[PDB]
Design a protein around this ligand. Structure first.
Ligand SMILES: [Zn+2]
Lengths: 147, 210, 98, 78, 48, 98
């Protein structure tokens, strides 16, 4: 939710037991009397301590369907499908631990069958999805009488 | 009653701008986008209509993170109707300090005469126009609005190369869109849109700012 | 226990000036033209989907969201909110389809 | 440089088993040992199981690019 | 409701799914980059 | 005929915009579409920096761009069938006739 940057990471954590000392200069161009002091400490006071471009990540990492297309690269599933599979692999490894059946399979292969079911369930090229979404709002729109 | 109302209102439309300059790369420190409306009274004039936070006092300029050769001015104009008379007052303040970009937070509207001569300056002065009305909300907080992020030219060609794609047959956002104007995006720049979906969790789609 | 205002008219900047009382992060409307012009086209696309689902679900019908996000991403393809009529077939390319 | 689906979709299987069944009919040379059936589709479906259909598929991308997949290369599902 | 379905049909007739998994029109125009924001089908998602 | 006259065989439309439409509808025959706003931007700039109704046939600053992005970027004369191109050209011709 909150905001991230290279210098916004620097200012709140290293420069608030430092900027909070007594300097009572004027507001130069609407800035604080201490914001110019922190930009003085940022622009010309350190070089190669710009490593907070990696502390604050330069972006989010992209999804595994934007990078690494889902029909070719295995286990490139959606981010709500990984949470479902990880919740189920946390539950299964607590209920298969004490269940006295065969249990020939483990987590490493349960995940593989769920991820290859995600991969094999991709809509194949040639699906004509436009008339499958022109009819799923066109056949139940004949059942809608006015009561 | 213009003592607490206009103080809260200028605090709000300054917090929106200092959350807007951070969202385009410009240097905004953390303690000055976490103002608590008592820091606005301790650091600014407390009575607006008397003129202690006058419309010459509130102007801020900040620099980009890459190079401080390209900056922007946040101009808060005095009169509620900015005509051509005060579109060329502030360009004299531009030329003396060598900038290219500035934002004018008009209070009740800019004239139809000056909104033509603001776009038709040159590609030299890229000047933007914001009403005070639409800077109380910060529409990039709304939980239906994606994370628009700007995109360099090195990453447009690779996404036109992955899909064997041209710029015509890519979807469009217009430049009068309320969030493309938040980021100040020209014609031609692709924006990357990270949709908080429910079928997936994130869905990257790309749009041209036409 | 979430108090929900639910007005019968639409004025977006009338409610923007009530921010310490109304949690304006979670606002909603029916009007796609009052969200495309205030909150953008990329949130006037997560309003088309909910305004189709909350028309079918009054009548008990449930439509899969993968059919609706294909209609919102077609109508908001040109940046504006186009209709699917005789005035949205002018944008098409084939004369033998028009 | 071929990056498409390794699998054979249902429309692929329809056109392959249709043309190959017409490439069994019209007195065309059959390419498997058989038992004496008389329907071209069963022949053309028992040849898909035995990796005998020699067809190349030109999977057009929307640009106009085409990849040349062989029916032998594509993993058919069971 | 012959009219509504007829219009949505003839405005979504072309939108077939391509070998790069992006839904495109009958003129190459990109509508979506993954079909339905995760790329799946409506039948084959029942047991996921 | 309602936009033309018998005395001089020309049309009564202003020639500040006929040159713009001529300059854009030869760009969109190629289908560049980045510069249907750039041509009207440079038309407005060339019309504000010096008013000149004496420019009767052509303008050199419009024609420099519409001979630059047509001679260059010439191989895409067949990728003009995109919805975004025919939408814009039917829009500009309809704004002209109306
Ligand atoms: Zn005449």
């Amino acid at each position: 939710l909150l905001r991230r940057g290279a210098f916004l990471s620097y200012s709140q954590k290293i420069q608030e037991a430092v900027k909070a000392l007594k300097l009572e200069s004027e507001n130069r161009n609407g800035r604080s009397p201490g914001t110019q002091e922190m930009l003085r400490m940022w622009y010309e006071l350190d070089e190669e301590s710009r490593r907070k471009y990696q502390k604050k990540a330069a972006a989010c990492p992209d999804p595994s369907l934007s990078v690494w297309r889902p029909d070719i690269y295995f286990a490139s599933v959606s981010e709500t499908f990984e949470t479902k599979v990880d919740d189920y692999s946390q539950e299964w490894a607590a209920q298969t631990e004490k269940s006295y059946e065969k249990s020939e399979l483990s987590l490493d292969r349960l995940r593989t069958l769920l991820q290859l079911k995600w991969q094999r369930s991709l809509c194949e090229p040639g699906e004509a999805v436009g008339l499958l979404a022109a009819q799923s709002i066109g056949e139940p729109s004949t059942q809608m009488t006015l009561n | 009653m213009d003592d607490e109302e206009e103080t809260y209102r200028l605090w709000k439309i300054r917090k929106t701008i200092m959350q807007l300059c951070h969202d385009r790369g410009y240097l905004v420190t953390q303690d000055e986008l976490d103002q608590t409306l008592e820091e606005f009274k301790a650091q600014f004039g407390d009575k607006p209509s008397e003129g202690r936070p006058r419309r010459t006092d509130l102007t801020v300029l900040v620099a980009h993170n890459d190079d401080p050769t390209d900056q922007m001015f946040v101009f808060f104009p005095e009169e509620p109707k900015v005509g051509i008379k005060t579109i060329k007052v502030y360009c004299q303040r531009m030329q003396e300090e060598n900038i290219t970009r500035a934002l004018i937070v008009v209070q009740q509207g800019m004239t139809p005469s000056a909104k033509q001569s603001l776009v038709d300056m040159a590609p030299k002065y890229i000047l933007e126009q914001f009403l005070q009305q639409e800077l109380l909300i910060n529409i990039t907080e709304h939980e239906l609005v994606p994370e628009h992020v700007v995109m360099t030219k090195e990453e447009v060609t690779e996404l036109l190369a992955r899909y064997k794609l041209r710029e015509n047959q890519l979807p469009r956002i217009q430049a009068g869109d309320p969030v493309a104007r938040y980021f100040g995006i020209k014609r031609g720049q692709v924006v990357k849109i990270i949709r908080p979906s429910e079928t997936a969790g994130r869905y990257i789609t790309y749009r041209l700012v036409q | 226990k979430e108090l929900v205002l639910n007005t019968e008219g639409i004025n977006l900047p009338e409610l923007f000036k009530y921010a310490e009382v109304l949690d304006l992060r979670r606002l909603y409307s029916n009007d796609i033209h009052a969200i495309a012009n205030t909150y953008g086209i990329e949130a006037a696309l997560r309003v088309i989907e909910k305004e189709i689902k909350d028309v079918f679900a009054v009548y008990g019908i449930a439509v899969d969201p993968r059919h609706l996000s294909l209609v919102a991403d077609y109508m908001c393809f040109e940046g504006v909110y186009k209709p699917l009529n005789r005035f949205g077939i002018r944008s098409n390319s084939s004369p033998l389809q028009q | 440089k071929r990056i498409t689906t390794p699998y054979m979709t249902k429309y692929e299987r329809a056109r392959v088993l249709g043309t190959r069944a017409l490439q069994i009919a019209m007195c065309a040379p059959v390419m498997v040992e058989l038992e004496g059936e008389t329907d071209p589709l069963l022949i053309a479906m028992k040849e898909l199981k035995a990796r005998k259909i020699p067809i190349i598929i030109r999977r057009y991308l929307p640009d106009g690019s085409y990849e040349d997949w062989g029916v032998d290369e594509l993993i058919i599902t069971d | 409701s012959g009219y509504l379905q007829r219009c949505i049909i003839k405005h979504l007739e072309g939108l077939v799914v391509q070998y790069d998994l992006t839904v495109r029109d009958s003129d190459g125009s990109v509508v979506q980059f993954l079909y339905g924001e995760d790329g799946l089908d409506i039948p084959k998602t029942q047991f996921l | 005929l309602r936009g033309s006259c018998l005395n001089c065989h020309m049309l009564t439309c202003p020639r500040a915009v006929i040159h713009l439409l001529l300059c854009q509808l030869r760009v969109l025959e190629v289908g560049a579409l980045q510069a249907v706003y750039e041509l009207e931007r440079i038309l407005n700039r060339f019309l504000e920096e010096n008013p000149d109704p004496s420019a009767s046939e052509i303008r050199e600053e419009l024609e420099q761009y519409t001979t630059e992005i047509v001679q260059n970027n010439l191989l895409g004369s067949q990728g003009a069938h995109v919805k975004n191109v025919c939408e814009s050209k039917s829009k500009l011709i309809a704004l002209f006739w109306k």
